[PDB]
């Protein structure tokens, strides 16, 4: 428990009690989410849930309360070298659903930035998901969440953190935080097979830009 303001504190997400960290990102992070809501329908599908909480038994999830409800959190997990080759696989199996355009496209930003080869580490904390109320913005409780998930790496021993900023609200915060970009890939020039574009977001969301942070 790190207490982050006078009214706000950072706990780690536990296994039992992930029911009410999903109540917060089907409200808060989910319908924002540029790739959530740039495909169809609005809802996230299960998989896409379930991947999300899978990352709970690591120890890297985080959440921020305010008078004992969530306003923020952050869900990170580990990944390897393996990742591009296990990513193209996962969006092929879901390859016609939502959750299949979501991959098609975080796929072609893993295989593209593939950190672990590019930076010659054998491991990186990616962060998968970060959202906080509405209410609460402006606060950098974004910012105190992506600290928290950082110490949790050096702690673990990663060298890295790498983050997928669909949202150019969290591109320009991990800017703040010193974060290197790596890679940018507009949504208008991601196509599926047939031509057509995967990901329509609403303006002011033009591109997923990744960034890494050196551990
Ligand atoms: C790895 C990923 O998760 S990428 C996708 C990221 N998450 C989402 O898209 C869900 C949208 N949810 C959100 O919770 C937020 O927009 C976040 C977490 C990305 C950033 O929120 P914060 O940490 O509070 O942003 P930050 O502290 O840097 O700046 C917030 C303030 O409101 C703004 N702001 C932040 N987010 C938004 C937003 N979604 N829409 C409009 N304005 C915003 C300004 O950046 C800043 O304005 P101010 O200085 O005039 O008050």
Redesign the pocket.
Same mark, same amino acid.
């Given at each position: 428990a790190k207490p982050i303001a006078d009214d706000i504190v950072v706990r780690q997400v536990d296994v039992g009690e992930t029911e009410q960290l999903m109540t917060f990102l089907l409200a808060?992070?989910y319908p &924002? &989410?540029?790739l959530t809501a740039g495909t169809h329908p609005p809802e996230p599908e299960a998989a896409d849930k379930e991947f999300l909480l899978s990352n709970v038994p690591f120890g890297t999830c985080f959440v921020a309360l305010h008078e004992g409800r969530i306003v923020a959190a952050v869900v990170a997990g580990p990944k390897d070298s393996h990742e591009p080759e296990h990513m193209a696989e996962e969006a092929r199996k879901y390859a016609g659903g939502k959750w299949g355009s979501i991959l098609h496209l975080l796929s072609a930003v893993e295989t593209a930035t593939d950190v672990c080869r590019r930076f010659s580490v054998p491991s990186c904390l990616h962060?998968? +998901? !970060?959202?906080?109320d509405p209410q609460? /913005?402006? /606060?950098? !409780?974004?910012?105190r969440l992506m600290e928290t998930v950082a110490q949790r790496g050096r702690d673990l021993g990663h060298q890295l953190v790498s983050?997928?900023?669909?949202?150019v609200? +969290?591109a /320009? !915060?991990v800017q /703040?935080l010193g974060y290197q970009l790596i890679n940018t890939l507009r949504y208008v020039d991601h196509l599926d097979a047939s031509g057509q574009q995967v990901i329509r977001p609403p303006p002011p969301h033009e591109s997923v830009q990744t960034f890494v942070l050196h551990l």
């Amino acid at each position: 428990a790190k207490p982050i303001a006078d009214d706000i504190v950072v706990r780690q997400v536990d296994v039992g009690e992930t029911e009410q960290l999903m109540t917060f990102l089907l409200a808060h992070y989910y319908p &924002e &989410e540029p790739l959530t809501a740039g495909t169809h329908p609005p809802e996230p599908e299960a998989a896409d849930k379930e991947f999300l909480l899978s990352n709970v038994p690591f120890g890297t999830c985080f959440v921020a309360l305010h008078e004992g409800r969530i306003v923020a959190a952050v869900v990170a997990g580990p990944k390897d070298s393996h990742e591009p080759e296990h990513m193209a696989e996962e969006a092929r199996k879901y390859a016609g659903g939502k959750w299949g355009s979501i991959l098609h496209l975080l796929s072609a930003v893993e295989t593209a930035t593939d950190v672990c080869r590019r930076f010659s580490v054998p491991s990186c904390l990616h962060v998968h +998901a !970060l959202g906080v109320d509405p209410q609460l /913005r402006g /606060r950098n !409780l974004g910012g105190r969440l992506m600290e928290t998930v950082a110490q949790r790496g050096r702690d673990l021993g990663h060298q890295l953190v790498s983050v997928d900023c669909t949202s150019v609200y +969290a591109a /320009r !915060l991990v800017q /703040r935080l010193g974060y290197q970009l790596i890679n940018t890939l507009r949504y208008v020039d991601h196509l599926d097979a047939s031509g057509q574009q995967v990901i329509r977001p609403p303006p002011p969301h033009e591109s997923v830009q990744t960034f890494v942070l050196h551990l």
